[PDB]
Amino acid sequence: SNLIEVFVDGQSVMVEPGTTVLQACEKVGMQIPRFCYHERLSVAGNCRMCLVEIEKAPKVVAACAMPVMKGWNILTNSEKTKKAREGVMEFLLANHPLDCPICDQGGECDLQDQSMMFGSDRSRFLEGKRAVEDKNIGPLVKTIMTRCIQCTRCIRFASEIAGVDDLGTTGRGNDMQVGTYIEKMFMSELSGNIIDICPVGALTSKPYAFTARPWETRKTESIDVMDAVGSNIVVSTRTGEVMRILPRMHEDINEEWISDKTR
């Protein structure tokens, strides 16, 4: 009808106009690497981890933002794509702190996992690293902002989803910092969700701090009873004890969010 034909590694796909290159790859069952893109937030296109090669085109495109055109062949595993990912991963890790053993994201970190699958296996950065001061934004969300990779997910979530315009970027260049600028607390009934959408250990659950690692927890898919919405949750347990509460995706109820009482 109004669908158009594109190719992902030569496999034909029929997509609605406006579908992005990243969304076309989902249909054939490929997940393009990402950091800044989140399907429930506005497109940002700043991390550049989603860069992919379109056949015959000399420039890689940001799959998360680029609308796919008719007849395009998206080469998701070509050397030009692979070298783009290795280059971006190299820049993301250049200033990242060597924190994994003390970092609570360790074991369920997108930076770790996409470094394993898409990055290089070693470093050639021979300088010193950036270090930034931490921001206090309440008793729920701990900030270790040296780990931040400036994806701006928290800013976009706070503004669009929570309707709170208290998070932004201050400064410029390598010294651009995410935060409130002034001493402010980010206290919203949905605030705890920035822990989930932050890809790194920059934002973490203060109550959960240091207590468990993700591989050792048992997951129980259950229902919230703090209100009458019936939000779908996952109860993380370990050796008989409840460790934390996570959202469970349900498009018709809570999507992938929960309230701060539930959390």
Binding site: E133, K135, D165, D166, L167, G168, T169, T170, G171, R172, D175, Q177, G179, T180, Y181, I182, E183
Partner: protein, 213 residues
């Protein structure tokens, strides 16, 4: 300098700032330059107007602008910290800004930089105890052919030598206002030693007009 604000007695949300009546009329004209429904476009000119009235931008000045335009205060904080012409700390009365990018560096911007430091007895980034001068380096000021040069407040002083800059500070320190422009012998961007072009009188109206217009 830092990009996080910590309240202090000189700089806190209750530091008194407000636009004068004259500046509110100017604010109205600034806001009228943009489509209705997009008043956020007035953030840059109105922060600058606040700084022109006050000299710098206390956090209370930032909050006033956010209140006038009905933009979240954070969105004004982002602008204030992004653009380098906004002073988030008090500066000296005469903000001396020495270009040190390669074209000016190639024409001995260092000699200018040391000329000012010995004269005022300060290092880059500092303010004199009498709070009259503040020295900082800056990137290309768009006057490269007249290098080396400095900008003091809104004025450019160009084709400088160590003597010329020491003289300018004496005039400023003496209550006088030196004349902006090249200090060598030429007027603007012309070759020194005689123009190599534009010596014939310019043509009058209608010269060269294509047929049938």
């Amino acid at each position: 300098a830092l990009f996080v604000h910590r309240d202090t007695p000189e700089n806190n949300p209750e530091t008194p700032f407000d636009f004068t009546p004259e500046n509110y009329k100017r604010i109205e004209a600034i806001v009228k330059n943009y489509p209705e429904g997009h008043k956020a476009a007035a953030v840059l000119p109105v922060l600058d107007l606040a700084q022109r009235q006050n000299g710098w931008l206390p956090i209370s000045a930032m909050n006033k602008v956010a209140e006038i335009l009905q933009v979240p205060p954070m969105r004004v904080y982002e602008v204030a910290t992004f653009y380098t012409m906004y002073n988030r700390k008090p500066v000296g009365k005469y903000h001396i800004q020495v270009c040190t990018t390669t074209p000016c560096m190639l024409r001995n911007s260092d000699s200018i930089l040391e000329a000012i430091q010995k004269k005022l007895g300060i290092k880059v980034g500092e303010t004199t105890p009498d709070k009259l001068f503040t020295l900082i380096e800056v990137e290309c000021l768009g006057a490269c052919v007249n290098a080396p040069m400095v900008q003091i407040n809104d004025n450019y002083y160009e084709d400088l030598t160590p003597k010329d800059i020491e003289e300018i500070i004496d005039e400023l320190k003496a209550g006088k206002i030196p004349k902006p422009g090249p200090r060598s012998g030429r007027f603007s961007c012309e070759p020194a030693g005689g123009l190599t072009s534009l010596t014939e009188p310019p043509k009058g109206p209608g010269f060269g007009v294509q047929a049938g217009l």
